[PDB]
Amino acid sequence: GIPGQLEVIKKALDHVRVGVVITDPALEDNPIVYVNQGFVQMTGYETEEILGKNCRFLQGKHTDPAEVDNIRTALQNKEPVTVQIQNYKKDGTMFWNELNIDPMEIEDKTYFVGIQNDITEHQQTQARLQELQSELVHVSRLSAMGEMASALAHELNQPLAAISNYMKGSRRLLAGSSDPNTPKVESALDRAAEQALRAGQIIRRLRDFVARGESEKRVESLSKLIEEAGALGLAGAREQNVQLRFSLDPGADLVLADRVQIQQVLVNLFRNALEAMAQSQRRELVVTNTPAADDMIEVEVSDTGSGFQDDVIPNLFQTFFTTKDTGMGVGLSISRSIIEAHGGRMWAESNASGGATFRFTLPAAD
Amino acid sequence: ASFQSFGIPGQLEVIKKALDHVRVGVVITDPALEDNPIVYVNQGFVQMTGYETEEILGKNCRFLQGKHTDPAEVDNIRTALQNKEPVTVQIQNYKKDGTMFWNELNIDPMEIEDKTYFVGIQNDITEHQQTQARLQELQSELVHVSRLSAMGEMASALAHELNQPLAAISNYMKGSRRLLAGSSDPNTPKVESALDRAAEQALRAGQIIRRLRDFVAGESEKRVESLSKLIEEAGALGLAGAREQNVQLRFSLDPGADLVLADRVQIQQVLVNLFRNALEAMAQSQRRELVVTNTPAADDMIEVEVSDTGSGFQDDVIPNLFQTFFTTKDTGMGVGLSISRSIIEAHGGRMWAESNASGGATFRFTLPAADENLEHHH
């Protein structure tokens, strides 16, 4: 019968996850007379702390008072109104409330039904999309320059190959020479050939690093990728009189990772450390790996550079945060997302020399 | 008898209407009836699926399933219901018009008195899944582009790295030639000739490496600048070698179409890049002539032209049919031109490329004039 039918739909209402309230405007200050379990879960308030209150109790410091005015106006004219608004859970947490209110007429009596949607997650995701799109535009000039470097490097292969052929041909001809100086010319040529090979390796590394590529997680040696990242990222270090120390542990060497991504994380720490040590009297860079909890391996990169002022540390990883006049402030933000996608954490601290120490973790392999 | 809210039928109507304002899909089924038919459905479900209430009531909800519905996740539901268990699946369903949508389905048993009902909550999350896929594409794109930009930040250090083995090679072969001097072996001149060709290739290599520093910065700020001064300074850097290459320089600069709003350093970089490209383009060429002019243009701009008689830009640039735009190819020079164009556009101007009668290249760009009227002055 009609009761029983009522009981069925009320229980169904408590299973919808959106918040549902009904207010009775014939009662002083338009109080909530019905609330479903969805609104309870959403707001953190118990039913007894909701029923009999006007809905404005969800409002707080950063609630837009003009969108509040939009609500009040719509209700005075018994008009429907949709609004996205700042509300507050019982524990004080802000949520974004997408509010939909409609007048209802039952037996010639007006009620208002409110449907509330917590869209905080939705707004976070949208903000993240906008932010990613913005970071891409932010680094586009530098990325073009990286493309130009890769392309010029590739073009460099051609005269190098020609130099090799000329030296190879020359060695052929010198084979028939009995001149006393002929061994010395051959030595010079071999040494030149070594240099051609080393120039070739620099090009190879640059080009492998910028390639779009496969993106698989695989068993990788930390020793190997630290040296690979160092070859790229630590250029100029010897000339800057920076003392490099890689203190590695062979028992903690294999991780599960996309090696180029871990390389780019290390390249960024290295370039940042060299920049931070530019005006430093002592210049020492230490890289260390150790076993860590939950079958992880922790990598530490420490420098003796200008380090971190007291207010700085909790901003380091924030997108666009930089202390440099020409900074982008994306490097650390991108690195942390790579590390978290590999299942680890990345963090920073001041060290005892007044410089900076960065740590990250990756899962150990077998 | 009871007034309005105080009464049962009034209450039923109020809650019925409330449920119809819930935009989520809500269905109630009755498992005591054959094949567990739907006995209640809200307007939310009507809106979501495209079916009217009359086309829903009395059916088993599997009627939304179709071609690419996962039988695994269907079986998961079937099992869970037989054991009166809550269940959530994300499943593929189809609207009345055949459109596929992603249905996040929450199903719970309800007891009203001693009777079991099932309540199903449906959410179309198709757009949510798309936003997630897009987010992952952008993240992945950023991670890649980020490696490129790390290398871009290191452009100058990369040049320094590459310069060392090249300089060593040149010295080894200069030293070798001295050692060969006065050898009486008849193959010696063939060796010397090869060493010299190799010395030339080493220099070519150095020219290529030097281009890495074309756009290396410093913070940029625009000021009133003299085009003629900019052109002169860029000439001294980029055209040193024109005499030895026997390139004729013909500069028709207009005093009084001279002042622009510009970043001195960036604009010099654009000019030096054009000047170097023009020299390279005119090596192995017949007529060797470089023309630079500046001229008032529309919308308060000044237009600069750099024309050569070289072999053309077809390896580095693809101009559109109207020669109002160009697409850069994946070469050192092509990417350099795209950086130059980006610098000009950040100055408010345009850069473009035309063929000329020599079969060479003409590049043109605009910068805002520091004075609001020329060109209506002739």
Ligand SMILES: Cc1cc2nc3c(=O)[nH]c(=O)nc-3n(C[C@H](O)[C@H](O)[C@H](O)COP(=O)(O)O)c2cc1C
């Ligand atoms: C059915 C209904 C639901 C409402 N839900 C909310 C809500 O979830 N959050 C909120 O801040 N205000 C909500 N309001 C609005 C407040 O109750 C009040 O109308 C608003 O603050 C404007 O009135 P005022 O200027 O007197 O505060 C709701 C109003 C109605 C009628």
Ligand SMILES: Cc1cc2nc3c(=O)[nH]c(=O)nc-3n(C[C@H](O)[C@H](O)[C@H](O)COP(=O)(O)O)c2cc1C
């Ligand atoms: C309350 C309720 C709501 C349901 N909603 C859907 C739905 O929206 N889409 C769907 O494909 N199946 C839905 N189902 C599941 C189907 O009715 C059916 O249980 C499923 O196909 C498994 O049973 P079967 O293998 O006999 O077809 C729902 C089931 C219940 C009890």
Ligand SMILES: Nc1ncnc2c1ncn2[C@@H]1O[C@H](COP(=O)(O)OP(=O)(O)O)[C@@H](O)[C@H]1O
């Ligand atoms: N090794 C380091 N020593 C001191 N400060 C650092 C170091 N690495 C990063 N930082 C600080 O973190 C900020 C953000 O760095 P990052 O995200 O790589 O972007 P950017 O280098 O463009 O600023 C830097 O501007 C600097 O303030």
